[PDB]
């Protein structure tokens, strides 16, 4: 694409500069260019890809929620015309485009070349996340299939992570956190969400004794997010 003429290493360097400057759209464009070079990504590069797109889509999701709230109130109210719906639809279409872009990178060809557990689980978690973001805005006849695509990606990631990673591994923990959120607020399964968060937390607790001080800090940080959700949900 527009990054085809830039060296892979320069794209990575510029993605890191864009992160420092809080230019997340640029960051994502640089990392998309890096992925499209066709080589596998290192751990650090996968993290840069994730940070970039999660910030871009996070801004879109927050804006969509503001606009959706205004639209819902308008349908309680004076007729103000089509503008609120039109603008919510504009933001929604942009958000869906970003999700489709990330899913396209995962399908062409990040997932199929990812053989180590850490990379494969990471990419499958990402796939579940971006289908989950599509599900947040889906209202039509494909909503069930979008939800099932998220579930299927998360489930494959969970199966690999349980077999190949320790219960304190940060990717395993972040995956479980996000799949639990999927259950709670996408799949209408709050009991499954709570069970998954509690079991994940307790199994990580029992494995903390094996860790260095730095790994302990990494794992306990995510465990606290699981606890935050359990406190909110119970």
């Amino acid at each position: 694409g527009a990054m085809g003429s830039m060296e892979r290493a320069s794209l990575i360097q510029k993605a890191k500069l864009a992160e420092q400057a809080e230019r997340y759209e640029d960051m994502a464009a640089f990392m998309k260019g890096a992925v499209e070079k066709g080589e596998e990504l290192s751990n650090e590069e996968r993290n840069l890809l994730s940070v970039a797109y999660k910030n871009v889509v996070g801004g879109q999701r927050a804006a969509w929620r503001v606009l959706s709230s205004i639209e819902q109130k308008s349908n309680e109210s004076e007729e103000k015309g089509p503008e609120v719906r039109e603008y919510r639809e504009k933001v929604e279409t942009e958000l869906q485009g970003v999700c489709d872009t990330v899913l396209g990178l995962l399908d062409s060809h990040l997932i199929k070349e990812a053989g180590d557990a850490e990379s494969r689980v990471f990419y499958l978690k990402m796939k579940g996340d971006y289908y989950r973001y599509l599900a947040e805005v889906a209202t039509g006849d494909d909503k069930k299939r979008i939800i099932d695509s998220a579930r299927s990606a998360y489930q494959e990631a969970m199966d690999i992570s349980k077999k190949e990673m320790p219960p304190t591994n940060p990717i395993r923990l972040g995956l479980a956190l996000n799949f639990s959120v999927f259950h709670y607020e996408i799949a209408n399964s709050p009991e499954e969400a709570i069970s998954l968060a509690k079991t994940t937390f307790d199994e990580a607790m029992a494995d903390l004794h094996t860790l260095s001080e730095d790994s302990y800090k990494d794992s306990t940080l995510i465990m606290q997010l699981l606890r935050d959700n359990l406190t909110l949900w119970t």
Partner: peptide, 8 residues
């Protein structure tokens, strides 16, 4: 209080 997903 919004539920947590994996961010930073």
């Amino acid at each position: 209080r919004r539920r947590k997903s994996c961010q930073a």
